[PDB]
Amino acid sequence: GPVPSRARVYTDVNTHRPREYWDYESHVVEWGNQDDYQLVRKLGRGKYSEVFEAINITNNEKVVVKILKPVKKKKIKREIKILENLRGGPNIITLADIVKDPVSRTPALVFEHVNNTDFKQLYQTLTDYDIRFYMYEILKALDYCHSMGIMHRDVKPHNVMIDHEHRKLRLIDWGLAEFYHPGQEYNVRVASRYFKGPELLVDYQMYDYSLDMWSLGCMLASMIFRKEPFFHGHDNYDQLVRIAKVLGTEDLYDYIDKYNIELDPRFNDILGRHSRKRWERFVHSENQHLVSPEALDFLDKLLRYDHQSRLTAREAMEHPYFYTVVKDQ
Ligand SMILES: O=C(O)c1cc2cc3ccc4oc(C(=O)O)cc4c3cc2o1
Numbered sequence: 001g002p003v004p005s006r007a008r009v010y011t012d013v014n015t016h017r018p019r020e021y022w023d024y025e026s027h028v029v030e031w032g033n034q035d036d037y038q039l040v041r042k043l044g045r046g047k048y049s050e051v052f053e054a055i056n057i058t059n060n061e062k063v064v065v066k067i068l069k070p071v072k073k074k075k076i077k078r079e080i081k082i083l084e085n086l087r088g089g090p091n092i093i094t095l096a097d098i099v100k101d102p103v104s105r106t107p108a109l110v111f112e113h114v115n116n117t118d119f120k121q122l123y124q125t126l127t128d129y130d131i132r133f134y135m136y137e138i139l140k141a142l143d144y145c146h147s148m149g150i151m152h153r154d155v156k157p158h159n160v161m162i163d164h165e166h167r168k169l170r171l172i173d174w175g176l177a178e179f180y181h182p183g184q185e186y187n188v189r190v191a192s193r194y195f196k197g198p199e200l201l202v203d204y205q206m207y208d209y210s211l212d213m214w215s216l217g218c219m220l221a222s223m224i225f226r227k228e229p230f231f232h233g234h235d236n237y238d239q240l241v242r243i244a245k246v247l248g249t250e251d252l253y254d255y256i257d258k259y260n261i262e263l264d265p266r267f268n269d270i271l272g273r274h275s276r277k278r279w280e281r282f283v284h285s286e287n288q289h290l291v292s293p294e295a296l297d298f299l300d301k302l303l304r305y306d307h308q309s310r311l312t313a314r315e316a317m318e319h320p321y322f323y324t325v326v327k328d329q
Contacts, residue, residue, distance in 0.1 A: 214303065
């Protein structure tokens with residue numbers, strides 16, 4: 001049996017909320033008017049939805065319509081309930097409406113427009129200052145959702161939408177997000193490969209908000225080092241090997257030993273023996289202007305095998321790395 005684990009913050013947020021807050025299966029969807037929205041341009045198709053630019057004819061404002069289709073039907077009410085719970089929070093995408101699409105016969109979520117950009121397009125060209133600035137903005141979103149008893153579970157550049165002109169950021173795509181209940185076992189098949197925490201990669205199910213902080217660290221490493229992605233696995237197994245080649249195998253074994261986790265024997269022929277590397281290994285003439293002692297220390301404190309040892313969102317906002325960033329107002 002593995003050793004149990006609990007979040008060290010916001011542990012019992014949901015246990016003290018009304019049933020209707022986290023019992024998303026019981027949620028009753030309020031439907032708006034589908035005729036308010038005219039689709040203009042198809043923007044993307046994910047595994048679980050199609051995304052359209054549209055216009056709201058009631059106000060002639062541009063909007064984004066996400067037509068849900070998921071193979072897991074429960075995710076519908078889960079995403080809706082989460083978005084309604086977090087509506088108005090700092091840097092959280094605002095669900096503006098929910099309509100029944102006439103063609104698909106499924107719910108369509110209507111969001112505020114975030115003109116026009118992630119970020120995976122910009123985040124490799126940002127200045128040092130801008131990296132710090134945007135990291136702090138993402139932290140505001142993550143502390144908010146965590147404090148509300150929700151983990152995002154899919155933090156990656158594509159889910160961070162940035163309007164660089166107004167220096168505005170939104171965390172999007174809450175389709176994988178879940179309510180944190182102490183002791184609950186969760187599905188390890190979440191997040192995108194390069195952003196998956198070691199807990200997912202070693203099949204440890206009792207994870208928490210701290211999963212998002214690993215993903216954030218992967219983002220930070222890619223930005224300051226100009227290496228996209230930072231941990232570049234060819235599959236979920238090689239993903240752990242790539243991590244171990246940086247953080248070392250001794251700390252990995254210490255982590256799995258702490259929680260009495262047994263590695264998939266698949267790793268015996270592939271993991272090898274790796275020392276922990278000093279972060280300076282990844283610094284070179286082309287990224288050095290983005291690296292500082294503060295950045296490296298901050299990164300070191302996010303990219304920890306032990307999910308319990310990582311900085312929380314709040315602690316991360318306290319870090320010296322953010323001292324140079326102008327606080328509003
Ligand atoms: O130009 C583009 O390709 C483009 C622009 C664009 C704007 C978006 C604004 C809000 C969103 O919320 C979600 C969500 O999944 O909640 C996805 C999106 C979303 C996806 C997008 O793709």
